[PDB]
Amino acid sequence: MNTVPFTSAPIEVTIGIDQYSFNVKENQPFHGIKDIPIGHVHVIHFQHADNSSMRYGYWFDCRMGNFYIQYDPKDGLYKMMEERDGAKFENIVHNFKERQMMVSYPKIDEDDTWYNLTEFVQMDKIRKIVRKDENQFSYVDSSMTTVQENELSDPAHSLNYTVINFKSREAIRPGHEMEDFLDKSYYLNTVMLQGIFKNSSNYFGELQFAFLNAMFFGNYGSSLQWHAMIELICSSATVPKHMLDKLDEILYYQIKTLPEQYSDILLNERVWNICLYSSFQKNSLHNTEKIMENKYPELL
Amino acid sequence: GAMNSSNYAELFNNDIKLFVDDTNVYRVTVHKTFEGNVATKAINGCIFTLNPKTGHLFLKIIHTSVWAGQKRLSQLAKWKTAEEVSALVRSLPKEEQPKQIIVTRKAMLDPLEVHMLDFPNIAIRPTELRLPFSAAMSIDKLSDVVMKATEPQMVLFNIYDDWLDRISSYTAFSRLTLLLRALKTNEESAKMILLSDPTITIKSYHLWPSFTDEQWITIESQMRDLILTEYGRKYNV
């Protein structure tokens, strides 16, 4: 079990850790989050009480170092930083714990939610989508645009998701115009899986990362990326059987975890109706279909 | 964006563009089988690709053989249309390739777009206009060459005959669409009006009769009258 201490909490903020969150008051003695499960990525995120615009946060993995949060009154936000002095860090963490100024990562033992949402997500791939290689953790916020969005401005701040475009040369073999546009199996298996992602796990990892960024920060280009990667699978007549069963599990927990009040901007009517009811894989997402109908029958 | 009544004069500027109409690509007769079930029999069809400024028509004849052993023919028809339009553009010298292609039915956008991926700078546009090009097979010479074809064939025509020697493309297009509108709403009456007078013949290299300016005025009024009468009939107005 690992710990992310906070230097202070000068401004009233709602702090999130993974799917959990806490209200912290201006200069409340808050000094961190303990008992964070080792073995998965995590995200700590923020929404100031004074600006319900720009949710922002940091993806990290405690195995990759000792990380803490510190408010910067110049830039006006909580910043993640790395402490290189291992002893100075054990020291701060022990004193804050002794003083019991830290909240406990509130995992119920029966609950595999965070594991199910992050099963294929790996820090190394996150850092390639969010390029800032002088840090071991990754900043994301509500407003960051994707590389594909930028094609249709500042690239240092871009989400470098893999570009998927169904009406592109990449996606359509010359001579198989009709075949490839109606059956995207070529694009999925040869171009994307074998070519770019190398395996299904990297593909699922980017899909899950995209969803989590759309959920936690309302990042709109992430939501576009999540739907595109779903649509590519569902729109492919020939998909490995293990990918379909795993996809059904992945989407189920994503839909399960989504806030009910956000289904209107986070869920694209067309993609979902096509995937669940028209696509080649209409019959391959039983759990995802059952939870969608019983929870959001309006969208369908 | 879409073509509509507002941006209608852009058809007659000097940017090359083509209308593509696919309504007559896949054509069937429906009949009863011996066991009493219904079956279709395909007849020869055509893609109607028209330069509205110059009157050059690129009539790509679609032979029934292209459907042999194919499924979901109405959907295939759209992809075959886009394939043939794409091949036409590629066959044209660069300075003749269109800058826009306007599809008369929205279902053609995705197939054409995919087939034109090699020409990113050719815009594929839909239209809000309700154009009567399906009536092209009411023009006797066009129907004839389509039905007699024994293989895929491209046939070139000027759909304006020689009108442009005397009138503008705007006026030519308005005349064409008025004639075709009439032919579409009441083919028998429309065709009666055009041929009633045996002294006004069609040149071997033309599609329509050799009317004088004044005779075109009487014709165009007779087509107008036809169209409004059929409207009152349709809607009991």
Swiss-Prot record, chain A:
Protein's GO biological process: spliceosomal snRNP assembly; spliceosomal tri-snRNP complex assembly
Post-translational modification: Phosphorylated on serine and tyrosine residues.
Entry-annotated residues carrying Phosphoserine: S236
Keyword terms of this UniProt record: Cytoplasm, mRNA processing, mRNA splicing, Nucleus, Phosphoprotein
Stretch forming the signal peptide: none
Listed result of changing S236 to D/E: Disrupts interaction with PRP8
UniProt effect for mutating S236A: No effect on interaction with PRP8
GO cellular component: cytoplasm; U5 snRNP
Location of Phosphothreonine modifications: T257
Chief localisation class: cytoplasm
Summary of subunit composition and partner proteins: Heterodimer. Interacts with PRP8 (via RNase H homology domain and MPN domain), competing with BRR2 for the same binding site. Component of a U5 snRNP complex that contains at least the U5 snRNA, PRP8, SNU114, AAR2, SMB1, SMD1, SMD2, SMD3, SME1, SMX2 and SMX3, but is not a component of the U4/U6-U5 tri-snRNP complex.
Similarity comment text for this entry: Belongs to the AAR2 family.
Note: Present with 7330 molecules/cell in log phase SD medium.
Function according to Swiss-Prot or TrEMBL: Component of the U5 snRNP complex that is required for spliceosome assembly and for pre-mRNA splicing. Involved in splicing pre-mRNA of the A1 cistron and other genes that are important for cell growth.
Name this polypeptide is given: A1 cistron-splicing factor AAR2
Originating species: Saccharomyces cerevisiae (strain ATCC 204508 / S288c) (Baker's yeast)
Curated annotation (Swiss-Prot), chain B:
Annotated effect of mutating D21N: Reduced growth at 30 degrees Celsius. Strongly reduced growth at 16 degrees Celsius
Chain spans, region RNase H homology domain: 7-237
Signal peptide: none
Source domain of life: Eukaryota
Mutagenesis or variant effect for R105K: Severely impaired growth. Reduced growth at 30 degrees Celsius. Strongly reduced growth at 16 degrees Celsius
Compartments where located: Nucleus
Known function: Functions as a scaffold that mediates the ordered assembly of spliceosomal proteins and snRNAs. Required for association of BRR2 with the spliceosomal U5 snRNP, and the subsequent assembly of the U4/U6-U5 tri-snRNP complex. Functions as a scaffold that positions spliceosomal U2, U5 and U6 snRNAs at splice sites on pre-mRNA substrates, so that splicing can occur. Interacts with both the 5' and the 3' splice site, as well as the branch region. Has a role in branch site-3' splice site selection. Associates with the branch site-3' splice 3'-exon region. Also has a role in cell cycle.
Miscellaneous note of the record: Present with 468 molecules/cell in log phase SD medium.
Subunit structure: Component of the U4/U6-U5 tri-snRNP complex composed of the U4, U6 and U5 snRNAs and at least PRP3, PRP4, PRP6, PRP8, PRP18, PRP31, PRP38, SNU13, SNU23, SNU66, SNU114, SPP381, SMB1, SMD1, SMD2, SMD3, SMX2, SMX3, LSM2, LSM3, LSM4, LSM5, LSM6, LSM7, LSM8, BRR2 and DIB1.
UniProt domain comment: The MPN (JAB/Mov34) domain has structural similarity with deubiquitinating enzymes, but lacks the residues that would bind the catalytic metal ion. Contains a region with structural similarity to reverse transcriptase, presenting the classical thumb, fingers and palm architecture, but lacks enzyme activity, since the essential metal-binding residues are not conserved.
The protein's name: Pre-mRNA-splicing factor 8
Native species: Saccharomyces cerevisiae (strain ATCC 204508 / S288c) (Baker's yeast)
Species classification: Eukaryota, Fungi, Dikarya, Ascomycota, Saccharomycotina
Full-protein residues shown: 1836 to 2069 of 2413
